[PDB]
A paper describes a structure:
Retaining α-glucosidases employ a conserved two-step Koshland double displacement mechanism, in which α-glucosidase substrates are hydrolyzed using two key carboxylic acid residues functioning as the catalytic nucleophile (Asp518 in GAA and Asp412 in CjAgd31B, a bacterial homologue of GAA) and catalytic acid/base (Asp616 in GAA and Asp480 in CjAgd31B). Mutations in the gene encoding for GAA can lead to enzyme deficiency which generates multiple phenotypic forms of the lysosomal storage disorder (LSD) Pompe disease (PD). Herein, we report a 1,6-epi-cyclophellitol cyclosulfamidate as a new class of reversible α-glucosidase inhibitors that displays enzyme inhibitory activity by virtue of its conformational mimicry of the substrate when bound in the Michaelis complex.
Structural data for the rhGAA-sulfamidate 6 complex clearly revealed that the cyclosulfamidate with the oxygen attached to the pseudo-anomeric position acts as an electrophilic trap, yielding a covalent complex with the enzyme and adopting a final 1S3 conformation in the enzymatic pocket after covalent reaction with the catalytic nucleophile Asp51831. The interactions of the cyclitol moiety of sulfamidate 6 are essentially identical to those observed in the rhGAA-sulfamidate 4 complex, though the sulfamidate moiety engenders steric constraints on the active-site scaffold. The bulky sulfamidate, liberated from the cyclic restraint of the cyclophellitol framework, pushes outward Met519, Trp481, and the associated loop region. The energy cost of this structural perturbation is compensated for by several H-bonding interactions between the sulfamidate and rhGAA active-site residues, pleading for stabilization of the abortive complex. Contrary to the previously observed inactivity of the galactose-configured cyclosulfamidate analogue toward α-GalA,26 cyclosulfamidate 6 in turn proved to be an irreversible inhibitor of GAA with a KI of 378 μM and kinact of 0.35 min–1. In comparison, sulfamidate 6 with an oxygen at the pseudo-anomeric position showed to be a 10-fold less potent lysosomal GAA inhibitor, with comparable activity for the GANAB (IC50 = 112 and 47 μM, respectively). Thermostability assays (TSAs) showed that α-glc-cyclosulfamidate 4 stabilizes rhGAA with a maximum shift in inflection temperature (ΔTimax) of 11.2 °C and a half maximal effective concentration (EC50) of 1.16 μM, whereas α-glc-cyclosulfamidate 6 does not prevent enzyme unfolding at increasing temperature. Kinetic and crystallographic studies of rhGAA demonstrate that the position of the endocyclic nitrogen dictates the reactivity of these cyclic sulfamidates, and whereas cyclosulfamidate 6 reacts covalently, sulfamidate 4 binds in a competitive manner, providing a new chemical space for potential α-glucosidase stabilizers.
Author numbering: 81 to 115, 123 to 197, 204 to 781, 794 to 952
Write the structure that this text describes.
């Protein structure tokens, strides 16, 4: 009974240090590891639940689960109900609940055969899910006992391979280590560092299968949890409350798994076009005069800038919905002037509301108190913590009245200063003291029987009391949703205040965040290590349906170097959300603050991003309508090439653009993986060294001097480009161009989505233009999917064709010789001047 292979041992003492005698007294096996692997582990006979009265419904199945021997945790729920729902051909859903008591549940909005088959083990109870096509076991919960106690849930499964991604937010490779890794989900204000619970929690994984198929698993549970990965390979979910609410997504393609997951949690929100421009912020722009000089200095040096930001500097004594009458006396005028120049404005908003001001002197607190918007303690008074303004209360964003109060505070402040979005920081929620000014009571929520591996060893560390009261439940159950609930409140407040698409960037997140807001990776150091770590983290958030993500360009903490800032701006120009942000005590890192050569390299990176904005916007449209990723790992695009599975220091934009950054000091080259096919050097496309890599699926060393980032265009793709501007207000008025990357057979395809860039309900109202581009047999045509006033007058003035083997003797536009074209025999590039409209059918041809 104790003969269990080391890698297959499941921990029977996850709760405490245990002796051999105590371990054997639990009915467990004690075998020291020979050098982590648990010494105390479950025999195959350890008591679990027994399946009884399995029954069939039109939805799927129902059963009773009965435990007859208690576990070592208090308050086992001895009788459970199993519900299995065969929802779609690619989505299986099952729940395990207490049929005698409603338990906390996360609030969530709602040949012919399924891709899965399901069977059950009777005793010990397990759910077994096969992929029907090849018989592969994806889920098998029989591998370890089911635990279901009031404050401890444990469900385990075999994994189909050593390759698993997800379970944000942690500083990790994209593929998680299965070598006895404990991953803790408990939203926490901590500067990103490995092995720590960070700002967000996403209880979703995507698991690769030999051959390139994949499945995903979502545990819809917002409690503090540990996820334990072991090398058998296997996974254990360990949650401190709620229920087991499990979704399995059958793929089979990794991109399909992500789309199926986003079908449940929500497709990403469509950002405004201006949100894809460059953002510039620091902590320390201490006046409107200084903030105006940033825009002036960027403009003078020809650096594009769409959005100027301020941190805490604008506030009166670090209070929300105020501005100081010293440095920021003319704040409204500053923001109005930004709008006059075609730029937008963003500023920080914290959740905590100053509670110490004289009564009647600070409306956000006074009105919050009147309407009962705050998280309360045992006696029903507001829980008071300590943040930037001093003593503060914390809004309860599960309370419908708090949502109305937040809408009013945002709308009233927007009447004073017309800001264009909200930067919501510290929404873990972050507390500078432990729990509250009055400490926390001694109860089972504050001191639970199982404490997951959180930094500081307590649920109260850097946050508010776990037993504090919210409208829907205790903070214990709702903590991991706090940031998400603020993002939802802020999204609605901005819609009501401005009547156009909201732009919310949030530190703390939960599963489904991307439906409402974007994210930045928080207080990263200005280091080569953190530049390199940003690529896996940006890819991970794209898999989790938060495509609007980035890191602080040049890093937040510490002082950047000029070389690091060049490399970080080059890579950061490919973050879907691109902001340079800087800490209070740091040396300046605005693009105009560097040497002339560094400025040139940073200007080129920004110029290329701005040229690509129509393409990036189209990629966001595909995320919003079809649950696609914007920035994606090579394995999402080439899953059948197992060499891609561990690549996380390269990224794709969509299907076609491969970015291979330098991520180390002193390098003038980079080695990157090129999947099978032809990859054209984007340097061969004119914008205002081998021309093509012919890959069999291999590593290629590329020249990468300080002024260069490697970007390659996949053969068979067409990308729309637009002319330059210092803002998207300017760039959106410029003529467009196509980059047409031909296959060997002369084929290529691409698309453009265009709307007014900011209106609500565009797709519902049909207020957009959608065009497909097709290259075939020495011709390029457009196919008009939808043409409306928004996009009709888009000018196409240049067509660049890559992979043209022989110089043409004639180039025609709608049957007439073009005014001008150039062919380069060295690079095989045909560059064509044209006078066309995206919204009217054209035919360009050469021979
Ligand atoms: C629930 O939260 C409320 C605040 O909303 C807590 O009120 C605080 O209660 C403490 C006493 O337990 C007060 O401290 C006292 O202040 C007076 C004078 O200011 C001083 O003479 C006493 O020796 C003592 O320090 C504190 O003022 C009060 N805070 C506020 C904002 O009024 C209450 O304790 C919380 N309940 C629990 C069980 O945590
Ligand atoms: C498993 O189910 C049996 C039978 O329950 C009955 O049939 C079901 C379809 C449903 O309609 C129930 O309401 C019925 O009671 C349970 O055994 C019965 O237990 C009751 C109450 O203890 C007893 O009065 C009956 O005589 C039993 N019937 C038989 C045929 O044995 C049984 O308890 C269920 N098991 C578990 C673990 O819940
Ligand atoms: C699901 O996992 C369970 C438990 O690991 C597997 O069942 C064991 O299989 C071993 C090896 O064949 C047997 O000797 C044991 O008797 C089984 N244990 C139990 C509790 O039945 C099971 O094979 C897995 N199922 C599938 C389809 O892979
Ligand atoms: C960041 O740099 C701060 C200022 O450093 C001083 O000024 C610049 C221009 C350099 O010449 C430097 O050598 C000077 O010492 C420091 O006060 C601060 O400690 C630095 N932070 C870190 C984390 O190194
Ligand atoms: C929040 C955020 O992480 C950071 O970018 C911001 O500049 C500061 C100041 O507002 C905040 N840091 S924190 O207060 O320490 O959480
Ligand atoms: C703007 O540049 C001027 C002139 O170089 C410089 O003195 C000033 O400090 C800069 N201001 C900011 C905010 O960068
Ligand atoms: Cl034993
Ligand atoms: Cl014990
Ligand atoms: Cl791995
Ligand atoms: Cl008012
Ligand atoms: Cl309620
Ligand atoms: Cl509850
Ligand atoms: Cl390899
Ligand atoms: Cl290698
Ligand atoms: Cl025309």
């Amino acid at each position: 009974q104790c003969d269990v292979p080391p890698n297959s041992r499941f921990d029977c003492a996850p709760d405490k240090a245990i002796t051999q005698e105590q371990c054997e007294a639990r009915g467990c096996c004690y075998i020291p590891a020979k050098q982590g692997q648990p010494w105390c582990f479950f025999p195959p006979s350890y008591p679990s639940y027994k399946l009884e009265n399995l029954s069939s419904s039109e939805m799927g199945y129902t059963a009773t689960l009965t435990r007859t021997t208690p576990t070592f945790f208090p308050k086992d729920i001895l009788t459970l109900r199993l519900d299995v729902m065969m929802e779609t051909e690619n989505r299986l859903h099952f729940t395990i609940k207490d049929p005698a008591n409603r338990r906390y549940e996360v609030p969530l909005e709602t040949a012919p055969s399924p891709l899965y088959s399901v069977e059950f083990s009777e005793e010990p109870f397990g759910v077994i899910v096969h992929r029907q096509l090849d018989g592969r076991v994806l889920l098998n919960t029989t591998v370890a006992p089911l635990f279901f106690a009031d404050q401890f849930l444990q469900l385990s499964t075999s994994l189909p391979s050593q390759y698993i991604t997800g379970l944000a937010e942690h500083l990790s490779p994209l593929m998680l280590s299965t070598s006895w890794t404990r991953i803790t989900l408990w939203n926490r204000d901590l500067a990103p560092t490995p092995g720590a619970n960070l700002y967000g929690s996403h209880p979703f994984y995507l698991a690769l299968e030999d051959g390139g198929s994949a499945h995903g698993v979502f545990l819809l549970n917002s409690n503090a949890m540990d996820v334990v990965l072991q090398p058998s390979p296997a996974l254990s979910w360990r949650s401190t409350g709620g229920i087991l609410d499990v979704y399995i997504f059958l793929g089979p393609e990794p991109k399909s798994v992500v789309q199926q997951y986003l079908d449940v949690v929500g497709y990403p929100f469509m950002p405004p076009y201006w949100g894809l421009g460059f953002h510039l912020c620091r902590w320390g722009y201490s006046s409107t005069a200084i903030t105006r000089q940033v825009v002036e200095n960027m403009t003078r040096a020809h650096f594009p800038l769409d959005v100027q930001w301020n941190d805490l500097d604008y506030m009166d004594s670090r209070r929300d919905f105020t501005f100081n009458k010293d440095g920021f006396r003319d704040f409204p005028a500053m923001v109005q002037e930004l709008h006059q120049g075609g730029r937008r404005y963003m500023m920080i908003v914290d959740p905590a509301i100053s509670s110490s001001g004289p009564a009647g002197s600070y409306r956000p607190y006074d009105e919050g108190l009147r309407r009962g918007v705050f998280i309360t303690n045992e006696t029903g008074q507001p829980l008071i913590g300590k943040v930037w303004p001093g003593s503060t209360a914390f809004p309860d964003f599960t309370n419908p009245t708090a949502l109305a109060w937040w809408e009013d505070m945002v709308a009233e402040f927007h009447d004073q200063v017309p800001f264009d979005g909200m930067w919501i920081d510290m929404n873990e929620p972050s507390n500078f003291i432990r729990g509250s000014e009055d400490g926390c009571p001694n109860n089972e929520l504050e001191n639970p029987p199982y404490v997951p591996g959180v930094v500081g060893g307590t649920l109260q560390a850097a946050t508010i009391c776990a037993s504090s009261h919210q409208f829907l439940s205790t903070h214990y159950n709702l903590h991991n949703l706090y940031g998400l609930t603020e993002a939802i409140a802020s999204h609605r407040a901005l819609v009501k205040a401005r009547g156009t698409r909201p732009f919310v960037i949030s530190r703390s997140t939960f599963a489904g965040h991307g439906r409402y807001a974007g994210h930045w990776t928080g207080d990263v150091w200005s280091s080569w290590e953190q530049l390199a770590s940003s690529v896996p983290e940006i890819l991970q958030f794209n898999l989790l349906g938060v495509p609007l993500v980035g890191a602080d360009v040049c890093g937040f903490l510490g002082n950047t170097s000029e070389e690091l800032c060049v490399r970080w701006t080059q890579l950061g120009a490919f973050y879907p959300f691109m902001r340079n942000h800087n800490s209070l005590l740091s040396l300046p890192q605005e693009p105009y603050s560097f040497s002339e050569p560094a400025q040139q390299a940073m200007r080129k990176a920004l110029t290329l991003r701005y040229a690509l904005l129509p393409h990036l916007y189209t990629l966001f449209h595909q995320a919003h309508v079809a649950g696609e990723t914007v920035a994606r790992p090579l394995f999402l695009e080439f899953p059948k090439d197992s060499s891609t599975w561990t690549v996380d220091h390269q990224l794709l934009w969509g299907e076609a653009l491969l970015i291979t950054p330098v991520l180390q000091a002193g390098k003038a080259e980079v080695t990157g993986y090129f999947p099978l096919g032809t990859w054209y050097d984007l340097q061969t496309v004119p914008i205002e060294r081998e021309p093509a890599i012919h890959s069999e699926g291999q590593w290629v060393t590329l020249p990468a001097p300080l002024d260069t980032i490697n970007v390659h265009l996949r053969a068979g793709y067409i990308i729309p480009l637009q002319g330059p501007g210092l803002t998207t207000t300017e760039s959106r008025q410029q003529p467009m161009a196509l980059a047409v990357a031909l296959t060997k057979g002369g084929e290529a395809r691409g698309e453009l989505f265009w709307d007014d860039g900011e209106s609500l309900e565009v797709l519902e109202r049909g207020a957009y233009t959608q065009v497909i581009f097709l290259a075939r047999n020495n011709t390029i045509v457009n196919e008009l999917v939808r043409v409306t006033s928004e996009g009709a007058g888009l000018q196409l003035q240049k067509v660049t064709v890559l992979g043209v083997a022989t110089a043409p003797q004639q180039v025609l536009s709608n049957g007439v010789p073009v005014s001008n074209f150039t062919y380069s025999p060295d690079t095989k590039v045909l560059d064509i001047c044209v006078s066309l409209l995206m919204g009217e059918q054209f035919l360009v041809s050469w021979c």
